[PDB]
């Protein structure tokens, strides 16, 4: 029961010897996400191209 | 400043008695590096106790020391009347300091 | 509009004219305890508008030579009512924070203070010589806050030591650069643009609930990034006002009556 | 959405109009989240560039040292007791990986410890010496740290060990998230105990910021082998790897040097930066 | 047994391997995590943010309060420069000890455009105007505002609302300029000049002043690693 | 084996000490002096470091103790600049020798004193 995934440049295999989970390979393939919650914090939605105080 | 002892302490020969050095949150509390001392009147002091629990060779493993807390503690069991001396606790403040004790007669009766 | 804002919470109520939107720490609002990450298996109290109110903390004197002041957080509300006396007989509880600044001054003052939240604000010792050395009579001072410095200074008097803080101010208390205390929550209370702010803090730890006594969770440091002066020392007076939200206490016990003489 | 490609710069014409993306208000709080095509006449451009080497397990994937720690086999005929070492394992001591840590408040990583072991003799040579054997034995808290270098607790009843023989390639093991919380914290604005009006002094006292005493436990080394005729001095490098690690809160990284396992400061090293001129390019 | 052969790089030690280990704590049941705000994913997530610039840096008045105040005056209009920057993220002294300075220490490559923002802290009743100019490398660096006028540019009008972002665009001869002082890949210079004097009424103070931020887009990235070189350990 | 000085008796001026080990001894390890006045008990002067002529000295005794060194005769001297009446007591040469198990900071090693000189006595 392998593991296959492709490389950004084709494939490589993985495959998880020991049951234990901290055994493994870091696997990289991490997710990203929307800077939203450090960057706009406000309760209201800023509209960029509005002027930012009414 | 000093580390804490008890002035005197007098038992006869056979018994089991201990001799206390209480500290601050520093020396004893946080660091390991305690260690005790042996002064026989007139000569140059002897280490007894080097690490915590840990003997050097020629010393009885009649003594024996023991850490709780603030406050560690050398138990002698079964005294002799060659142990009659002075004895001083010694240890480690945070920061690059050394810290003697104020000291402990201990009299055979 | 967006300026004017009404901020109810118990029968308390804020209403300011010259408000920025307010700030959400971290995107989230203050929770309740989910089942999914409740470790206590006693049942909680929730005193909610007992102690969902807003108290208003000692006012500050802001001078020309004022160089800033900090708070701890639940710290300062220990003495604040219902909320301190569930603080003192509670083992664990866990509580967000609206905290509120303000401060008021005419359209020919200028200047401008960051008002900026620190989870874990941990701050620097007075010895050279003795680290993590600092008492707990000195280190959590209650509604009166602290005061930043702006130099350094140890005691000397080893036989008898202060065992105080001594922040210095652009250091930021601990050691850290001014200029990158903005990646905290924050806002910039500028006295030409906005007389307040708000921010609004979830309950942030490693743990689900936590010992309040022990344990301080946020800190709040108000900074003058520009000094005050007007056409003359001028004082404005800077009013914190903080209101505890989705508070929950566990684990009653005796009262616990800290030292503090 | 992990190792794909930045948004692409839209084309943007002149503009005349009432929409004001250049003016914001920092008071708010908010960061004015614009684009290049917001304010000046970008072209179109396909981007190619990716975040993946920005991320955050790929920012702590490379090992760092944390101990270097020594251990000897004393020459036979001398009295001194051969030193074994033991060693509070922590990672505040070393500079490099403590900064990088206290970029964040709370963080959760799996540790994988790696050994690198090094000797070398202290004398002249008068008979050379074996191949030697050093057992690492992790000493989780409360358990009885060792008197003796043969010691009865050396047995390893329940304790974790590895064996280590000079000259094959360095040894590894990985520890799960060992941490009794549901992180670490890099900080702790508390203290361990509350005095009490109750209490005397000497009680209820306690450190600031030291959230515990033993966090994560002991490691201990020693020469498996008997004493040598000749001295033979090493010394063991101890490298920490965390894995899929997660941080929580982000935090300025520490400018001024630091002194002891708290944030406090030396006196007079508290000059960061230095001289130049406002108008000098 | 199966036949194998050994290659290169058998037996060593990299410090950036991905490799597999056995577990010193067999069956540990790990403690599960909790929905802890503010989890970060990426580190330009923090890039993103705005931080203060410390613009003085005189040998009176530096490592105080007062090198992040840019002191503006309503003296009779001259075409001398307010401030100067180098743009160089990791080694102008200025721009180094910012955030974006500091994730970029430990990066030896970035791209991407930068948010450059200034905060006027005057009166309500003061007004007036600011050149803010970026000038790609390769000329003589602008000393007078007729040579500055001709680059990138932004007139930024002090009224109600309170700050003004010029954003760099991402002018550059390589993909990824490197965070060292290479004349190969400077990043050119910034200053900001009055367009107009700040004019304000009697009963004000005459002197006021400013605070700048550095953040990038979205656009940025980095990617090298290496050791700072801000921090040092003795003994 | 470590050999002290002389014995010296001048009030109120200075007093200079002398202390002189093997060089095994002064090269690889810390030198420290301890005071011992009579039944008061043991007091930590300060600390010389030959193997890097770093020098620590405590707060009771910094304004008033310079320490030196000298690699030709594997010798180190310790000079009392102002002496009170207090200061008459019975003076310590240590080195200290005994390693520790438990790793001090995480790059170090602490060593415990367990050699001790004769000693001398010295009247204000």
Redesign the interface.
């Known amino acids: 029961g392998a593991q296959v995934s492709s490389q950004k440049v084709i494939n490589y295999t993985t495959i998880n010897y020991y049951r234990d989970s901290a055994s493994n390979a870091a696997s990289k393939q991490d997710f990203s996400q929307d800077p939203s919650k450090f960057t706009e914090p406000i309760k209201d939605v800023l509209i960029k191209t509005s002027p930012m105080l009414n | 400043s000093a580390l804490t002892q008890p002035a005197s302490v007098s038992g006869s020969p056979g018994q089991s008695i201990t001799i206390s050095c209480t500290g601050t949150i520093t020396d004893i509390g946080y660091y390991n590096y305690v260690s005790w001392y042996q002064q026989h009147p007139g000569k140059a002091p002897k280490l007894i106790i080097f690490d915590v629990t840990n003997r050097p060779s020629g010393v009885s493993d009649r003594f024996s020391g023991s850490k709780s807390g603030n406050t560690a503690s050398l138990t002698i069991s079964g005294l002799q009347a060659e142990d009659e001396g002075d004895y001083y606790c010694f240890s480690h403040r945070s920061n690059n300091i050394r810290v003697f004790g104020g000291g402990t007669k201990l009299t055979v009766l | 509009s967006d300026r004017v804002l009404q901020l109810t919470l118990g029968n308390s109520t804020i209403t300011t004219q010259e408000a920025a939107n307010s700030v959400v720490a971290y995107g989230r609002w203050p929770e309740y305890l989910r089942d999914s990450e409740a470790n206590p298996v006693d049942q909680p109290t929730e005193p909610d508008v007992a102690a969902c109110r807003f108290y208003t903390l000692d006012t500050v004197s802001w001078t020309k030579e004022s160089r800033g002041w900090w708070w701890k957080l639940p710290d300062a509300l220990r003495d604040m009512g219902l909320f301190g006396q569930n603080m003192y007989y509670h083992y664990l509880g866990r509580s967000g924070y609206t905290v509120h600044v303000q401060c008021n001054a005419s359209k020919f003052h200028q200047g401008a203070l960051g008002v900026f939240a620190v989870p874990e604000m941990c701050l620097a010792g007075d010895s050279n010589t003795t680290t993590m050395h600092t008492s707990y009579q000195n280190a959590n001072p209650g509604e009166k806050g602290g005061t930043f410095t702006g130099t350094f200074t140890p005691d000397d008097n080893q036989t008898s030591p202060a065992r105080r803080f001594c922040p210095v101010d652009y250091l930021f208390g601990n050691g850290t650069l001014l200029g990158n205390a903005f990646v905290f929550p924050h806002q910039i209370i500028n006295l030409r643009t906005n007389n307040c702010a708000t921010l609004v803090l979830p309950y942030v730890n490693s743990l689900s609930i936590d010992s309040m006594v022990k344990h301080n969770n946020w800190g709040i440091a108000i900074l003058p990034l520009a000094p005050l002066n007007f056409a003359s020392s001028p004082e404005i007076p800077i009013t914190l006002t903080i209101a505890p939200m989705c508070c929950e206490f566990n684990g009653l016990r005796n009262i616990t009556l800290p030292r503090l003489q | 959405t992990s190792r794909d490609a930045l948004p692409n710069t839209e084309a943007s014409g002149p503009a005349h109009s009432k929409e004001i993306p250049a003016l914001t208000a920092v008071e708010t709080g908010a960061t004015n989240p614009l684009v290049p095509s917001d304010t000046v006449q970008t072209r179109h451009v396909v981007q190619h560039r990716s975040r993946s080497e920005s991320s955050i397990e790929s920012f702590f994937a490379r090992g760092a040292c944390v101990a270097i720690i020594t251990v000897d086999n004393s020459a036979s005929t001398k009295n001194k007791d051969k030193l074994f070492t033991v060693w509070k394992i922590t990672y505040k001591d070393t500079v490099q990986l403590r900064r990088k840590l206290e970029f964040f408040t709370y963080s959760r990583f799996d540790m994988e410890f790696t050994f690198v072991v090094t000797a070398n003799f202290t004398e002249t040579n008068n008979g050379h010496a074996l191949n030697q054997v050093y057992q690492i034995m992790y000493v989780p808290p409360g358990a009885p740290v060792p008197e003796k270098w043969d010691d009865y607790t050396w047995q390893t009843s329940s304790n974790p060990s590895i064996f280590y023989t000079y000259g094959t390639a360095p040894a590894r093991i990985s520890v799960p998230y060992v941490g009794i919380s549901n992180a670490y914290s890099h900080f702790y604005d508390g203290f361990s105990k509350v005095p009490l009006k109750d209490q005397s002094a000497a009680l209820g006292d306690s450190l600031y910021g030291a959230a515990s005493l033993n966090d994560f436990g002991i490691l201990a080394v020693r020469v498996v082998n008997d004493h040598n005729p000749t001295k033979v001095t090493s010394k063991i490098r101890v490298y920490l790897k965390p894995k899929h690690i997660r941080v929580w809160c982000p935090r300025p990284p520490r400018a001024v040097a630091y002194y002891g396992p708290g944030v406090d400061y030396k006196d007079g090293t508290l000059t960061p930066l230095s001289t130049k001129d406002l108008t000098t390019y | 047994g199966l036949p194998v052969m050994n290659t290169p790089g058998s037996n060593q030690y990299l410090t950036a391997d991905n490799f597999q280990s056995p577990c010193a704590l067999p069956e540990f049941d790990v403690t599960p995590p909790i929905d802890i705000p503010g989890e970060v994913k990426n580190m330009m997530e923090l890039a993103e943010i705005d931080t203060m610039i410390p613009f003085d840096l005189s040998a009176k008045k530096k490592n105080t309060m007062e090198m992040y105040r840019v002191r503006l005056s309503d003296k009779p209009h001259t075409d001398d420069p307010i401030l100067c920057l180098s743009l160089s993220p990791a080694s102008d002294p200025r721009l180094s000890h910012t955030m974006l300075g500091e994730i970029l220490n430990y990066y030896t490559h970035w791209a991407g455009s930068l948010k450059f923002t200034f905060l006027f802290c005057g009166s309500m009743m003061a007004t007036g105007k600011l050149l803010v100019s970026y000038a790609p490398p390769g000329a003589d660096p602008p000393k007078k505002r007729k040579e500055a006028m001709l680059g990138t540019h932004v007139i930024w009008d002090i009224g109600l609302q309170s700050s003004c972002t010029m954003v760099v665009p991402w002018i550059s001869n390589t993909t990824y300029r490197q965070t060292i002082d290479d004349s190969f890949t400077e990043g050119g210079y910034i200053s900001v000049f009055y367009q107009t004097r700040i004019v304000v009424p009697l009963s004000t103070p005459r002197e006021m002043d400013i605070l700048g931020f550095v953040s990038a887009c979205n656009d940025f990235s980095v990617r090298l690693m290496r050791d700072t070189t801000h921090i040092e350990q003795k003994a | 084996l470590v050999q002290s000085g002389a014995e010296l008796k001048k009030p109120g001026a200075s007093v200079k000490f002398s202390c002189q080990a093997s060089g095994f001894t002064f090269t690889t390890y810390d030198i420290?002096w301890?005071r011992q006045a009579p039944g008061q008990?043991?007091?930590?002067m300060g600390?010389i470091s030959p193997s890097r002529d770093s020098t620590?000295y405590?707060?009771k005794f910094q304004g008033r103790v310079t320490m030196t060194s000298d690699t030709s005769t594997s010798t180190v001297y310790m000079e009392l600049t102002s002496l009170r009446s207090e200061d008459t007591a019975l003076y310590?040469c240590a080195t200290a020798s005994?390693?520790?198990?438990?790793?001090?900071?995480?790059?170090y090693?602490?060593y415990?004193?367990?050699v001790?000189?004769?000693?001398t006595t010295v009247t204000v």
């Open positions: 420290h301890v008990g043991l007091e930590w600390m620590i405590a707060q310590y005994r390693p520790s198990a438990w790793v001090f900071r995480s790059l090693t602490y415990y004193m367990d001790w000189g004769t000693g």
